[PDB]
């Protein structure tokens, strides 16, 4: 896995989820930032399990691509994040979707607390018109610190 700036960029859910879980055990949960860039399972399954065989139509301009991506986000990705932060019943009370010609961005946000420390979880998920890759950004920070 790459460190793009001071942030780890993972290529699979296992590495990403394990990072978040370990950093939670290590009391670092309120100052985390990592990324995950991958192709969603459905698009690989549609393309002979080869990124080079993915249709050029499989991108943010395909209603089917977007719908199936959202389904994966809601069934798997968020479930993994909730498991890792030890809050399986968490709900994100901030949700948004922004669509431009070039990309669709979903945001899921929640102010929560763990070990007596309040913190904000922000999950950004981006898909684009250029190709089928999905870009996840996971970031936390304290709330109301002085």
Residue numbers in the entry: 16 to 161
Publication passage describing the model:
Transcriptional control of YER067W by the main stress-responsive gene activators of Saccharomyces cerevisiae explains the wide range of conditions in which expression of this gene is induced. Additionally, the functional evidence points to an involvement of Yer067w in the oxidative activity of yeast that is coupled to ergosterol metabolism.
The structure reveals an α/β topology with a seven-stranded mixed β-sheet backed by four α-helices on one side. The secondary structure elements are arranged in the β1-β2-α1-β3-α2-α3-α4-β4-β5-β6-β7 order. The longest helix, α4, transversally crosses the β-sheet and is mainly stabilized by hydrophobic interactions involving the nonpolar amino acids F80, L84, I88, L92, I96, and V100 that are facing the inner face of the β-sheet. Analysis of crystal packing reveals that Yer067w forms a dimer in the crystal. The most prominent patch of invariant surface residues is located in a cavity at the junction of all four helices. However, the conserved cavity is long and has a largely hydrophobic character, hinting at the large size of the ligand and suggesting that this cavity is likely to be a protein-binding site.
